[PDB]
Each structure stands twice: as C-alpha cells, then as structure tokens.
C-alpha cells in the first residue's frame, strides 16, 4: 500500500494566510514564509510584556506633564497621594489629567498640601499635632 | 540515536566486545561445567505427593499395574526423550502421607520411596528403557501409526 | 601535486531538440 499526502495544499495555506501582508517573496513562498511567520508569532507573544511596560511609561509621562503644570514633580504627587490613602493608579490618574482637569488640580493641591504637612512635621520636634490631612484612617 | 560515533550510525561492536580490553567472557579459564551435558541421563522426578494426588483424583488407577504409559496418559509426568530423559525417578517427597497400594514400574527409586510403597502393601520395580523404547512406551498411538 | 582535470559532461541531446 503506497500512501501519499493528498492535502498538502491546505497545510501550506495554514501558514501562508498569516504571511499575506508580508513584503517580498516571503508572503507566498512557503520555505521563506514559514520562518518569518514563526518569528511574527514569537514577537506577538513577547510583545505582551512590552505593551504593559510601555503603557505605564506613557501614563508616567502624561502624569509628569500634568503635575508640572501645577508646579509639582511626578514623585511628589504620587508619593503624597499614597500618604493620603488615595489609591488611584497611574492609568486613572493619566485619564483624569486629560478629561477631568479640575479634579486633577484638586488632587495636585491635595498632594501639595500633604507634602507641606510632611515638612512641618519633620521640622518640628514632636510638639506639633499631626496634620489634618496626615491623619491615617485605621482599619481592623 | 545520539550524535555521531558508532552508535548513531549503527556500527557499534558485537555483544561481548569491551573496546579492546580482553573481554570478561574470554579472560575466565575454561572449566568442564557443561562437558558431556548432552550425554547425561535425566529422570523426571515423581514425588509420592504427586502420585497420591493423581490416585485420589482418578487420573491414575491403582487397581492395575502403573507404568510410564499410565502416568503419561494420566498427565502425571511429561517425558521428553529428545531431551535425554530416560524416564521417571521416584522421589521420597510425601512419604509420610502416602497411603495408596500400587504396583508401579519406574526407572529410578530412592530408598525411602521404595519403603513407602512397600509399607502400604505395594510393589515397586525399577525398569530401564532405551531412548527409542521410551518414545514408544510414552506415546504408543503415534508409534502404531508408523506401521512398524 | 598530482594533475587534477575534470572533463565536461554533455547532457542528453533530446532535451534541447523538442519542437512544437
């Protein structure tokens, strides 16, 4: 009994369908396409890490820009918002800067206020009571 | 198959070859463990336990003389004349519980096996069969079909 | 170094003789 592959055409089309938008002969020549298609799929897999990384870099750049408009550096805003128990993440903070500029100025003002309270406390010797915005809500 | 060498290509040395070191199976001195093995007489053991068990199940009849034919026809012993078997040796295993009275013809019998049969009123005889005779007595029907 | 020569091999004629 002599067996021969009868559906090789379909096996080839499984790869070439992913190579139609490629440049040059590697969009139609299996030998060439198969290598480039594999590389494309590997890139797609690893890009999921970069997508997350690049998104956060973008948010920090955008938050940095918005903070500077109010005379605040990025680390001062983020650090002091945490000390106020405001857990807004960078994605939302970047969205607020673009579409809710009045709320963002309020957040910038709050961070600036908390930052100044920190300085007053550090300069004092413990005589002063805790700042109004420095008080932490305790949970149990 | 691995990578290169003789083994990937299927050219590794014969079994027993050790790479050039004088092989284990050659460096041992010759000794006559098996010298003359094919000319040694062999006897299939038949214990008194087996003999009694065959009698109790009706596979061997003690009312008639028992010999190699009756034992073979009862599937008590399997004799191989072509493997230098010369018959059955009666072995003493089971003597304490042997109760049957039998007239039995064997090729070899131990002293204690003879005592067991004789204590119970039976007769035991030691009989010699040559290789050809053993083949015929063990399987009579195939012989009769030869016309000799 | 021993003289090394490789002679040319002609292909079968018919392969260049087919007509319409």
């Amino acid at each position: 009994l002599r067996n021969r592959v009868t559906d090789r055409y379909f096996r080839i089309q499984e790869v070439l369908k992913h190579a139609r938008h490629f440049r040059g002969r590697k969009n139609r020549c299996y030998r060439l396409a198969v290598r480039t298609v594999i590389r494309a799929f590997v890139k797609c897999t690893k890009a999921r890490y970069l997508k997350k990384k690049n998104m956060r870099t973008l948010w920090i750049n955008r938050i940095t820009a918005a903070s500077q408009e109010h005379g605040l550096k990025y680390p001062a805003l983020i650090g002091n918002l945490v000390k106020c128990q405001v857990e807004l993440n960078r994605k939302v903070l970047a969205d607020l800067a673009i579409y809710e500029p009045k709320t963002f100025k309020s957040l910038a003002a709050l961070a600036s206020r908390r930052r100044h309270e920190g300085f007053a406390a550090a300069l004092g010797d413990g005589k002063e009571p805790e700042g109004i915005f420095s008080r932490v809500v305790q949970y149990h | 198959r691995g990578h290169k060498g003789e083994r990937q290509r299927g050219t590794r040395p014969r079994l027993g070859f050790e790479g050039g070191q004088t092989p284990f199976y050659i460096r041992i001195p010759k000794y006559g463990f098996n010298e003359g093995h094919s000319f040694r007489r062999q006897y299939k053991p038949l214990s008194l336990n087996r003999l009694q068990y065959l009698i109790d199940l009706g596979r061997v009849d003690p009312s008639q003389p028992i010999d190699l034919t009756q034992l073979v026809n009862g599937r008590g012993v399997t004799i191989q004349p072509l493997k230098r078997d010369y018959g059955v040796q009666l072995v003493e295993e089971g003597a304490d519980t042997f109760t049957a009275k039998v007239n039995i013809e064997v090729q070899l019998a131990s002293e204690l096996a003879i005592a067991a049969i004789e204590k119970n009123g039976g007769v035991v005889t030691t009989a010699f069969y040559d290789p050809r005779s053993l083949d015929i007595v063990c399987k009579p029907v195939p012989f009769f079909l030869r016309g000799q | 170094t021993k003289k090394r020569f490789t002679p040319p091999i002609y292909q079968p004629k018919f392969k260049t003789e087919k007509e319409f």
């Binding site: 009868t6 090789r8 055409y9 | 198959r1 083994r7 299927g10 050219t11 590794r12 014969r14 | -």
Partner: protein, 97 residues
C-alpha cells in the same frame, strides 16, 4: 497544483457480495470438525508462506530452501544477494546489541 480539481468517481462497494457474505466461514473447521483439518490449511498463497510467519530475512531463507531450485536465474541471483544484505544488516548493524 498537486490537487485534483474534480471529485473522483464515487466508490461503489457491494458489502453483500458472495465473497464478503461468506468471509470467515470454516475458520473453526478444526474446533467444530473433530480437528480433521487445521484452519491453516484454508490459507491459499505461495507454498513457502502457507501457515507460517517470519521476518523478511526468514522469508527469503525459506523461499530459497523450498522453491529456489525452480526460480529464474535472475530472480535467484537477486534472492541470494538479498539474503547476504539482510544477514549483514540484522547481525552487525543496529542500535541494540
């Protein structure tokens, strides 16, 4: 290229032809027939393969032994050469020793 552009002619199989209908009959010729005939005697084919099985080297040796004297000169030469090649392969070449 490489794939036919039309469907092949439909496959018509008569499952109840006499050959298929009676397949297997007398396979228990011995068990049900007092063992006068062995089922292997129902096998039809080359005289050196009836009721016997072996690897290609064994088949070659068996055929040369049973019908080698009746083989054609060219066929017998090929058979002798095949036996030599297979002898070398199985006895000297392989992964296991």
């Amino acid at each position: 290229i490489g794939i036919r552009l039309t469907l092949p002619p439909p496959k018509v199989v008569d499952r109840w032809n006499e050959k298929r209908a009676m397949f297997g009959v007398y396979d228990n010729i011995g068990i049900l027939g007092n063992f006068e005939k062995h089922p292997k005697e129902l096998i039809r084919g080359p005289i050196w393969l009836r009721g016997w099985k072996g690897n290609e080297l064994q088949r070659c040796i068996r055929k040369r032994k049973m019908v080698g004297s009746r083989m054609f000169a060219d066929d017998l030469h090929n058979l002798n050469k095949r036996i030599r090649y297979l002898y070398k392969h199985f006895n000297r070449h392989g992964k296991f020793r």
